Amino acid sequence: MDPDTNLLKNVILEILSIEPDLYKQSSIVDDPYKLAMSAIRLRATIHELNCCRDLGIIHNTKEISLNMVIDRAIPIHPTFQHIVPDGYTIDRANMTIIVLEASTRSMPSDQKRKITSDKLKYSGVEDHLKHEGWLFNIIVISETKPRNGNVPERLLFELLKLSLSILSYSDKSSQWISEEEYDELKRSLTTYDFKTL
Amino acid sequence: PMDPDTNLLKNVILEILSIEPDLYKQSSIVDDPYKLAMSAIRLRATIHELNCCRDLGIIHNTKEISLNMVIDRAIPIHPTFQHIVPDGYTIDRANMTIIVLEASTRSMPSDQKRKITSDKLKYSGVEDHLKHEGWLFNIIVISETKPRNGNVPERLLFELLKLSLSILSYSDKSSQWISEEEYDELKRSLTTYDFKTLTSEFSGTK
Amino acid sequence: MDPDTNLLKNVILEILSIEPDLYKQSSIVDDPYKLAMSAIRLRATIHELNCCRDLGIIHNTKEISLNMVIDRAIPIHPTFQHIVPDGYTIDRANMTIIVLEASTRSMPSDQKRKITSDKLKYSGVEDHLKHEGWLFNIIVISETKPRNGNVPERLLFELLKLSLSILSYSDKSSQWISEEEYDELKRSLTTYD
Amino acid sequence: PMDPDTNLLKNVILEILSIEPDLYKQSSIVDDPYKLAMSAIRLRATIHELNCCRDLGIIHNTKEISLNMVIDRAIPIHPTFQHIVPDGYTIDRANMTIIVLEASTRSMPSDQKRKITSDKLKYSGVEDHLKHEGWLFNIIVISETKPRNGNVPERLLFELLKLSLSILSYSDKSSQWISEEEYDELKRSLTTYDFKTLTS
C-alpha cells in the first residue's frame, strides 16, 4: 500500500498548487483510508468549484444555509427547510438569487435520479420568493465526470484510481465508505472514458 | 502568536479522539490554525451527534448515506425522495419502523426552535409515503444549548469552543473560513459557560 | 523532532480507532521522549491484547495478581509469590485457571531465555492448584514480532521506527530507557523485515 | 459532577510533579476523570517507592530493568532466573553485594505481612545461586500503612487518595478501570486514615 498513498499525497499536493482554495477541505494524512476518503471528497469539491466558476457564483465553502442566503436578500421571510447549496449568488441589481446543486454520477439514469432528489429539496421556495418579489433560479447539474477546470484530468483520474486501490485492498474499508458510494466510484473507474486521458 | 492556542487545541483534539476513537475517522489534526479551528468546531458538533445517537440507540451516520439509501435498506422499491443526510438512523425490520435523527446545538431557545423547524421541514411528505406502506417513520429533531458530551469530559468540549474562537478572533481574515452567523453563534455559546471555566488556565495533557 | 512526533501521535490515534481499550495505557503528549516511551509500551500491550484474544482470555489491564486470581477461585489458600500475569481466565464450571505471559524478542535465543524466566516465576503454583483438583495452565509466548491482530502491521512498525528515531536522537534518551531495552528494540528494528 | 474532583486532582498532581520532577517521567496528567484517577493511584505507589529508595540510598528502578539484567551487570555468566522487576536495586561491585527493594502500602498489618511474604517469595533460590558465585544478595521488603511522602506534603498524598476514590465511587463505569480488590484496599486506607500526622 506504500506507493499508493505516497503518490496520492503528491497528487493532492499538486492539485492544491493549482487551486489553493481547495486547501480548506484537503488532507495529506498518513492514514491510507482517511487519505482515500479525503481524495474522494476532493474530487467532488473540484467539480463544485469548477461548476461555480463556470456559472460565476460563490462556492459555498462556509456551508451557509438557504435561510442564510435568503437573509442576505430579504431579511424577513418564513423559516424554510434546512438546505446547504453547493453554490449561490445574490444579484441585488437584478433582484435574483441563484443556487447550485452539483454532483457526478457515472450512469445517466443515476444522474436523473440525483437531479430529482436535489431539486425536491427546494419545494415551495420559488413560490415564496415569487410572492415576496424575487427571482430564484435553482441550477442542478449531475455529470458523468467531475469538471476539471484548471486541474489536469490526469490528476482527477489518479484521485479516483488511487483511492479505490487503497479502499479495495481490505475488509475494514467498510467502516469508511458506504457500499453505494464505493460502487458509484468503482463504476466511474471501470467505465472511465480514457479518450481524454 | 496563535501558536500557543494552536498547540493546545491540537492536544485537546488528540485527547478527545483517544477517549472516543469512533470520532477519529471524522476528524483531523493539522498545524494550520484556521483549519484546526474549523476541525475543532466540526468535532464539537460531531460529538453531540454521536452521543444523541448513543442515547437513542441508533446508528451514527458517519458514512453519510442519504434518506433514499436508508429507505432502500427497508423498502427496495420507492419513489425518489428529496436528498437528505440524517445525523443518525436505524431500521427496525421487526417493528417495521425507521428512525431518523437531526441533532444540533444552539445556545438560545429561539434559535433552537428555528433550527428544529428548519430540520423537520426537510422531511415534508416522507412520513406519509412510509405510513402508506405500513411502516413507521419517526423523525427525532434535537437542538440543545450545549453539546451532549457522553464519555468526553465537558471541559474538553469547552476548550474546543474557547480555543477555536480565540484563534478565529485574532484576525478577521478567518472570515473566509467561518460565516458571520456561525461565528456569532459560537460567541453566544461561549457566554453560557461559567466564569471560572471561562477564565481558568487549561494546560491539556502532560 | 516534530515530524516524527506528529506522525507518532497520529499512529497512536489510528491504533486506538481499531482497539479503543488501548486508551487505558496510551499517551498523546507533546514531550517526544515521554511519547516514545508510551509508544514502546503500547507495542508490547498490543501483543498482549492479541495473544489474549487468540486464547479467549481476559487481558489483565487492571493488573490483578496471581494471589487475587486464586482468591476468586479458591477463597482459602497459602500466600503465593507476587505475579501479575498479562492475561488470565477463571473457568469455575470446569475448575480451570489459565494465565498468559506474552512478550517479543528479536532473537530466537532470547525468546527461549525470556520464556524460561517467565515460566520460572510460577514455580510450585501448578502443583498447589492440581492438589485441589484444579487445572492451572501457564501459557508463555515469546515471538519475534508483536501479534497485530486487527491492527495493520504498518502501525506496529511505525511505533517501533518512530520511537527509536526519537530516542536515538540524543543521549537525553538515557534518562528514559535502559541500555538493555534500547538495544533490544534497536535489534528488532535493524532486523525488521 | 466529577468536574470539581478532576480539576483539583489535576492540580494536586501538578504540584507533586513540581516538587519531585523525576515523577514526571512515570506519571500522567489527563483530563479524563477515570484515567486521571488511576494515574493518581499509581503515582501514590510510585512516591512510596521513590522515597523508600532514597531513604535506603538505592536506585529507584524507573526504567524497570529485570533481576536478570541487574545480575547481568554484576556477573557475566549465570543461570536464567525468574523474571522479577524490583522497585529498586544497587550493585556494590567492590563489596560483591547486590541489594534489591520491594516496597508497598497496605492498610492492615495482616495484609502487610501477606504482601511482604508474596514479594519475598518471588526471589526463591536467588540468594543461594549468588552465594555459589561469590556474591551477597540482600532483599529488602517494606509494606507500610501509608506511602512514604518525603518532600511531598502528606496533604497532597491524602488528596491523591481521597479524590481518586471520590471519582471512582461515582459509578459502575469504574469497573472498566480498577479491580474491586484494589478499590477496596484504597477505600480501607481512606476510611481508617490516621489524621494525627496531617495535624503536625
User: Is C145 one of the annotated active-site residues of the chain?
Assistant: no
Residue A99, C-beta contacts closer than 8 angstroms, at least 6 positions apart: A66, A69, A83, A85, A87, A88, A122, A136, A137, A138, A139
Query: Which residue has cell 516514545?
Result: C36
Q: What secondary structure does DSSP assign to C68-128, as a single string?
A: HHHHHH-SS-PPPPP---SEEEEETTTTEEEEEEEEE-SSHHHHHHHHHHHHHTTTTHHHH
- Residues from chain B that touch C28, judged by Cβ atoms under 8 A, are 11, 14-15, 18, 205
- Phi–psi pair at D155, nearest 5 degrees: -55, -35
Resolution (A): 1.9
List the domain range (segments joined by +) for residue B71. Answer: 56-144
CB B86 within 8 A of CB B70: yes
Q: Tell me the C-alpha distance between C184 and A115, whole Å.
A: 61
Q: Where are the beta strands (DSSP E) in A40-162?
A: 58-59, 87-91, 96-104, 135-143
- Residues from chain A that touch C154, judged by Cβ atoms under 8 A, are 1
Q: Tell me the C-alpha distance between C151 and C8, whole Å.
A: 15
Q: What is the CATH classification number for the domain harbouring A139?
A: 3.30.70.2640
Q: Tell me the C-alpha distance between A67 and B27, whole Å.
A: 27
Q: Which of D25, D113, D115, D146 is catalytic?
A: D115
Q: Cell numbers of A125, please? A: 421556495
Nearest CA distance, C62 vs chain D (angstrom): 5
- Phi–psi pair at B41, nearest 5 degrees: -65, -45
- Phi–psi pair at A12, nearest 5 degrees: -60, -45
Q: What secondary structure does DSSP assign to C34-54, as a single string?
A: HHHHHHHHHHHHHHHHHHHHH
Length of chain A counted residue by residue: 197
CB D178 within 8 A of CB D34: no
Q: Tell me the C-alpha distance between C98 and D130, whole Å.
A: 32
First to last CA, chain D: 32
Percentage helix, strand, coil for chain C under 3-state DSSP, each rounded to 5: 55, 15, 30
The partner residue sitting opposite A62, judged by closest CB among B35, B118, B179, is B179
Q: Which of C9, C24, C112, C114 is catalytic?
A: C114
Scan residues 132-161 of C and list those with Cβ closer than 8 Å to D: none
Phi/psi class of residue B194: alpha, beta or left (left: φ > 0; alpha: ψ in -120 to 50)?
beta
> Which of C4, C5, C6, C14 to substitute to test the interface with A, most A CBs within 10 Å?
C14
B110 interface with D at CB cutoff 8 Å: no
The closest alpha carbon to D85, from D55, D118, D62, belongs to D62
Q: Tell me the C-alpha distance between D65 and D69, whole Å.
A: 6
Order of strands, sheet of A135-143, starting from the edge strand that comes earlier in the sequence: A58-59, A87-91, A96-104, A135-143
CB D19 within 8 A of CB D152: yes
Scan residues 14-33 of C and list those with Cβ closer than 8 Å to B: 14, 16-17, 20, 23, 26-31
Alpha helices in chain D (DSSP H): 3-19, 33-56, 67-74, 109-121, 126-132, 154-169, 180-191, 196-199
Tell whether the torsion through CA atoms of C137, C142, C146 and C149 is positive or negative: negative
- Residues from chain C that touch B22, judged by Cβ atoms under 8 A, are 17, 20
Query: Which residue has cell 467539480?
Result: A47
Residue A27 DSSP SS3: coil
The closest alpha carbon to D104, from D5, D185, D14, belongs to D185
Question: What single-letter amino acid sits at A26?
Answer: S
A83 burial (CB, 10 Å; 0-12 / 13-18 / 19+) is buried
The closest alpha carbon to C188, from C161, C149, C154, belongs to C161
Q: Cell numbers of D114, please? A: 501477606
Tell whether the torsion through CA atoms of C74, C78, C82 and C85 is positive or negative: negative
- Residues from chain D that touch C181, judged by Cβ atoms under 8 A, are 63, 65
B69-87: burial string, b at 16+ Cβ within 10 Å, e else? bbbeebbeeeeebbbbbbb
Q: Cell numbers of C82, please? A: 507476587
CB D79 within 8 A of CB D129: yes
The partner residue sitting opposite C10, judged by closest CB among A1, A29, A172, is A29
Q: Tell me the C-alpha distance between A173 and A171, whole Å.
A: 6
Element (H, E) at B103: strand B97-105
CB C188 within 8 A of CB C160: yes
CA–CA distance from C52 to each of B163, C82, C87 (Å)? 41, 21, 6
CA–CA distance from B24 to each of A34, B6, D61 (Å)? 9, 19, 36
The C-alpha R_g of chain D, in whole angstroms, comes to 19
- Residues from chain A that touch C159, judged by Cβ atoms under 8 A, are none
User: Nearest residue on chain C to A31, judged by CA atoms?
Assistant: C14
Residue C115 DSSP SS3: helix
Question: What single-letter amino acid sits at C79?
Answer: T
